[PDB]
Amino acid sequence: WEXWDXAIAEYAXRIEXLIXAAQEQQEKNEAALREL
């Protein structure tokens, strides 16, 4: 119960980590592309 609901909400932690990464890469990429 409020163990599984733990596991699922804190996978949904991991995905909001993945969507971190992607925001950071989006910023690096913009800057880096402006410089080329």
Binding site: D5, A12, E16, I19, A22, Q26, N29
Partner: protein
């Protein structure tokens, strides 16, 4: 400049879908 503006577009949809999922998991836990 378009391929990267669309990485952002996709990132924005994914991020909205995440929030929408969270409201959906909320409805389910709200019916238990």
């Amino acid at each position: 400049s378009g391929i990267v503006q669309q990485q952002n577009n996709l990132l924005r949809a994914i991020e909205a879908q995440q929030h929408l999922l969270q409201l959906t998991v909320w409805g389910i836990k709200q019916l238990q």
